[PDB]
Amino acid sequence: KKWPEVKIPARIITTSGNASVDGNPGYRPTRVDSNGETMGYEMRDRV
Amino acid sequence: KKWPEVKIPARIITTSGNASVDGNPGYRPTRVDSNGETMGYEMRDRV
Amino acid sequence: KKWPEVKIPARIITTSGNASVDGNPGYRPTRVDSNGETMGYEMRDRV
Amino acid sequence: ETTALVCDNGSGLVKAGFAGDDAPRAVFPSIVGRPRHQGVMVGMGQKDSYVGDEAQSKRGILTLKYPIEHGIITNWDDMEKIWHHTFYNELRVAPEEHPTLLTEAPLNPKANREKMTQIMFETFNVPAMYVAIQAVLSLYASGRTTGIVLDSGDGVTHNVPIYEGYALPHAIMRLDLAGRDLTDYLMKILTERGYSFVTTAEREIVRDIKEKLCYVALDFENEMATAASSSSLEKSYELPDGQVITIGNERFRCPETLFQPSFIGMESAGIHETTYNSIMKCDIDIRKDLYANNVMSGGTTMYPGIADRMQKEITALAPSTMKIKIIAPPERKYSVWIGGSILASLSTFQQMWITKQEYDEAGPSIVHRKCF
Amino acid sequence: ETTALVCDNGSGLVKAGFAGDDAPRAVFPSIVGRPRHQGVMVGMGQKDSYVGDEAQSKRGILTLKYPIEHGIITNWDDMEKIWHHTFYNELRVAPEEHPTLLTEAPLNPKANREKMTQIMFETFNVPAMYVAIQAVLSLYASGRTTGIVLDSGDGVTHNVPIYEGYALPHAIMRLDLAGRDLTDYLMKILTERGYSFVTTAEREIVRDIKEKLCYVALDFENEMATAASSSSLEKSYELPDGQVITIGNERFRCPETLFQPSFIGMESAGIHETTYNSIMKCDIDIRKDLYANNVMSGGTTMYPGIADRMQKEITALAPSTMKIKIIAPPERKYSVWIGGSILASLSTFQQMWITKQEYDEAGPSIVHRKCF
Amino acid sequence: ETTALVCDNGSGLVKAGFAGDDAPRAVFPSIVGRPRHQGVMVGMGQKDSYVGDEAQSKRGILTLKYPIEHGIITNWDDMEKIWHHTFYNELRVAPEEHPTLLTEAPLNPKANREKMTQIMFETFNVPAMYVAIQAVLSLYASGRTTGIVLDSGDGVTHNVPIYEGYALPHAIMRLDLAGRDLTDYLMKILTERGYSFVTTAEREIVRDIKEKLCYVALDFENEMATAASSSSLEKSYELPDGQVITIGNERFRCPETLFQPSFIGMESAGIHETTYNSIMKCDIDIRKDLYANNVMSGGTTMYPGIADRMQKEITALAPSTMKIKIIAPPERKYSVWIGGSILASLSTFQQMWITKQEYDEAGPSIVHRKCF
Ligand SMILES: Nc1ncnc2c1ncn2[C@@H]1O[C@H](COP(=O)(O)OP(=O)(O)NP(=O)(O)O)[C@@H](O)[C@H]1O
Ligand SMILES: Nc1ncnc2c1ncn2[C@@H]1O[C@H](COP(=O)(O)OP(=O)(O)NP(=O)(O)O)[C@@H](O)[C@H]1O
Ligand SMILES: Nc1ncnc2c1ncn2[C@@H]1O[C@H](COP(=O)(O)OP(=O)(O)NP(=O)(O)O)[C@@H](O)[C@H]1O
Ligand SMILES: [Mg+2]
Ligand SMILES: [Mg+2]
Ligand SMILES: [Mg+2]
């Protein structure tokens, strides 16, 4: 038995808190955005 | 010979009598009604 | 005409009630000790 | 059946011990406490509830609650737990072979006594038991044939006149203002200086502050006038966290609510003028001996200055030619228990126990025929 | 003395304005801010501090701090600055010729009133001033003269039973759980979804989220169940950086702490049942009219569905025969101030002012004699 | 179930090992690295990614990145890679038959737990698993059940007040100022002296410099003053290239930002004054035992002089009459893991495990019911 995948909500980059973009130079920050609204950011890929 | 249990009459909370709600903050006041004749109160449980 | 200052007594920081340290992050609490005990506390200045 | 047990189920302090002894074996608060916040440490083995000194010591993590209010048992599960504790842990005695004497305030609901007796005879299997009024025990404690007792522990203040061993039930007066109610007023008035207290453990701290710093004025207006030059009457107190409270007027404002219930908003007369009214309801010839034998008992008669305040008020009310004499032995707190231990050992009293064989034939209704 | 001023210097908003007006002239926040970073730009003329709307708008660069904590003035320099602002900038009035009425929470420390009066008479030089309890003013605002009037502003909640103009001071109840603490609890639960907010400006953002999206559940477990099924209960919000939040359960978990203070860790009962306890402390005949006149006021009584929820709770606690009617005029937020604007306008009130010559003849201690 | 595994998913250092052992079997950085430059040799033994010590040693060619940021998993592919590494290469253990205990920071996003549980049950297929908060494990490693526990790893600092087995969730405090963020400040301030580490490989060199040279003060101002005698403070360091660095003020400037977050622009208070605030949020009676049992844990409490500095600050804040005793065992770095290796061994704890069936009957939501 497997359950459906549970997904992380897109992060809000506050001035101090759960994430900051400079902490991990090896990921690019990428935006997630649909229905005219951008739920926040994810960390990904190269360069 | 186990005789039947007697029941404490529900307390009638007057203005300055032998009963007041605030004396035991560890109990909540509970209404013990009987077909619209509310009788009085008894105290138990959290909050 | 003028009258002498009515100095505010140092606040006693009860676990809940009219005083708490964290409610104002713009002030630091300081010791206001007299005769070997802190009495209460006062809040001022940076951090 | 070797030795009787005596229990004063105080609204604030359970006082228990064997009969014949001059002091209770064990004294502990009548407090049952439940853990407030969630436990996280597996295998520490925390109990689901605490009672007496266990609750008092760990009060910071518990929601303390009093089963007694104004002398009336309001929660019988916690009261049964307190009974079980005071028998099996403090006195370390199985109650199924010891007769037991219990002290109750007057003018209490009859169902309270009936269910108390039911608890005694069905879940503790006490061989024989009796209920005596708290104030009448104070006359055995003082060793007197005659007197107007004033008793006030934590739950009530009440006064009973007794003359040559005959009570005067129609003259009994009762007020529900007492220790716990008077602690709450101290919590209120401490906010005038900024010292807020809300939780029940902090109410216990306020109780400690009251017991250690409060006193009763001789003239309340002169203490108020001298407190204006607020240097002499102020006293400090150290909280368990290390802060220091300093209180001025509050240390005599709080006990004065006994002498003026208008402060807590009650219409009734003070601790004085109710003793005097009980004396007024007595027979004309009785009053001479009552003025000279006004006997104080119970915890809230412990303040410094109490006897002077009350004597000054009673002399002001009573006729000038009568020599008022208030009696206040230093053992006010345990006097009710001392009287209970005294009379329980009397050879004549052994006929007045409610026996198990009497209860199983007449039930919890037996108490109204055997006891006062 | 042409026109009185009225000020509700609560923990959130400084509602100030003249008498006779039906609405306050300025509702700027009671906030003072200092620059957090170094001002590299020479000749910009940047000030050393900002207050009110200036600090609120430029919050991204300032360390916002509230001079009021739970209804008590904690920093008198910043509070004097706020007084100076509300007089000279917002109202554009020189206070040295306008009598001023100030509204304070009950059971406050007396030194707060003393120093407030000293400030008003000795640095602003008002010709007269008076202090009134915030909840009592919401009766004049509702026009009626009986009710268990209840206030939940930003800093405290309290409820003050009044009947036919007479206050019942012994029945006053107070909780230090309001708009600030609710905002902090909303910040705490927003981390469950990853939306971390730690700075003081982010508190103002979470206060906006609180005011725009939160509502009170009619049945908490049912709303929890319907939120646990993925459904239209969940709402989005847009930050001043354009990043988009979504909140589900949190938008009714936050206001529910008013009814279950256990969520914020307090032992005290909720806004319901404390309002019931103050009704129980009242006289027996008074409760008929208190149940029918439960007047609400202050900012944190604005949550949608609060009236129905509390009405259900009070009808559950109270006897079934009772008709219960919560009064909530749509102007809840300004009702304390509207009450002061009525009171200051009355011909019968004009003798109750604390005159300048009454102050300098007796010091700041005049307040406890002239005022409630 | 043979023997439980215990894992601390350190933001900087993963710790793994079996229960009952007093030290973790394997410790390696939580680093996943990709080849930055193109490969030209054919059949070199190529891998598309390196993890742990392989990435750390080959760092000159790899773009090292941390899946953990401030205690939260920011990339799940690299985290699954790290999980697979610590199971199959370091421990050399098939996780299909070993229950696993994981240590997480408090106030984390619930989705972090739910996806972690889904991973451990659906790709590594552990028979049972549990989540525990690192501070409670440190308190178990102290052999204690009462006291403030302050854990500051590479990702976050957090303090959790515990008393006699009960946690105080409302008093928990959390800061993202920790080891990784502290290395970045050293990277910034090293440019004051000309050194210009910019790459993620040089990040590790700066971390090594911090670990081997940095220390804390008794008075930051005095240490700044001793920079006038600019010979005694300075220490040398040799890079892998052979270049020799010398640093003065920077070696204690970097740790000092823990006590003054303003250095890196954060508004919140330091590592001190947040422990003190968490203590003051606790119940009044609770605080006496908290000051005497201030346990530390985590890698960034390892700077020499941390105990002295924080003891001085806490004694300055707390009342003078209260004895303050910071507990700092030598094994602070592994104390979270040792706490887990105790907890997972307890016979009483065997009922707390989230079994495979308890997951597959209720999905990843099970954690919020079973775990704290
Ligand atoms: N030294 C003291 N000074 C003043 N008040 C005291 C003192 N010691 C105790 N108290 C008060 O007295 C109460 C205890 O008195 P006590 O006679 O033992 O009452 P009780 O037996 O618990 N209740 P009661 O049944 O009403 O007699 C405490 O709860 C306090 O309110
Ligand atoms: N629509 C709303 N919904 C929910 N909360 C609100 C709303 N409007 C305002 N608030 C809250 O109410 C606070 C202001 O209410 P207000 O009555 O002005 O408090 P106040 O008078 O300053 N406080 P106080 O006098 O100390 O009790 C704000 O700071 C918010 O916390
Ligand atoms: N000897 C040391 N001196 C100073 N700092 C150190 C030392 N050893 C480790 N550190 C710092 O602490 C970090 C690792 O500490 P550790 O206790 O392993 O935290 P973690 O478990 O990796 N993080 P978290 O999951 O948030 O607890 C390193 O990356 C450094 O930043
Ligand atoms: Mg008693
Ligand atoms: Mg207000
Ligand atoms: Mg860690």
PDB file of C-alpha atoms in Angstrom, chain C residues 9-18 37-41, chain D residues 193-199 202 238-239 241-244 246:
ATOM      1  CA  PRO C   9       7.091  50.456  40.413  1.00  0.00           C
ATOM      2  CA  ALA C  10       9.159  47.842  38.618  1.00  0.00           C
ATOM      3  CA  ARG C  11       6.889  45.368  36.850  1.00  0.00           C
ATOM      4  CA  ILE C  12       6.719  41.823  38.218  1.00  0.00           C
ATOM      5  CA  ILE C  13       6.742  39.531  35.185  1.00  0.00           C
ATOM      6  CA  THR C  14       4.136  36.907  36.096  1.00  0.00           C
ATOM      7  CA  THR C  15       3.751  33.869  33.797  1.00  0.00           C
ATOM      8  CA  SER C  16       0.582  35.512  32.458  1.00  0.00           C
ATOM      9  CA  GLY C  17      -0.988  38.885  33.041  1.00  0.00           C
ATOM     10  CA  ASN C  18      -0.195  42.576  32.698  1.00  0.00           C
ATOM     11  CA  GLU C  37      17.182  41.450  44.830  1.00  0.00           C
ATOM     12  CA  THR C  38      15.902  42.603  41.447  1.00  0.00           C
ATOM     13  CA  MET C  39      12.459  43.810  42.625  1.00  0.00           C
ATOM     14  CA  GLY C  40      10.860  43.838  39.180  1.00  0.00           C
ATOM     15  CA  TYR C  41      12.107  44.885  35.742  1.00  0.00           C
TER      16      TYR C  41
ATOM     17  CA  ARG D 193       0.708  48.236  42.634  1.00  0.00           C
ATOM     18  CA  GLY D 194       1.139  46.298  39.373  1.00  0.00           C
ATOM     19  CA  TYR D 195       1.615  42.787  40.816  1.00  0.00           C
ATOM     20  CA  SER D 196      -0.749  40.738  38.676  1.00  0.00           C
ATOM     21  CA  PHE D 197      -1.508  37.113  39.563  1.00  0.00           C
ATOM     22  CA  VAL D 198      -3.883  34.870  37.623  1.00  0.00           C
ATOM     23  CA  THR D 199      -3.067  31.164  37.784  1.00  0.00           C
ATOM     24  CA  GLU D 202       0.135  32.099  41.814  1.00  0.00           C
ATOM     25  CA  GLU D 238      10.636  37.213  47.675  1.00  0.00           C
ATOM     26  CA  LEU D 239       8.950  35.238  44.901  1.00  0.00           C
ATOM     27  CA  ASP D 241      11.566  33.277  40.652  1.00  0.00           C
ATOM     28  CA  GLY D 242      13.608  35.818  42.636  1.00  0.00           C
ATOM     29  CA  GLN D 243      11.576  38.995  42.187  1.00  0.00           C
ATOM     30  CA  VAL D 244      10.739  41.002  45.315  1.00  0.00           C
ATOM     31  CA  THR D 246       6.782  45.245  48.325  1.00  0.00           C
TER      32      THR D 246
END
